[PDB]
Design a protein around this ligand. Structure first.
Ligand SMILES: [Re]
Length: 10
């Protein structure tokens, strides 16, 4: 993302 992460099932 931008210093992190979200893009994943749950
Ligand atoms: Re993400």
């Amino acid at each position: 993302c931008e210093h992190x992460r979200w893009c994943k099932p749950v």
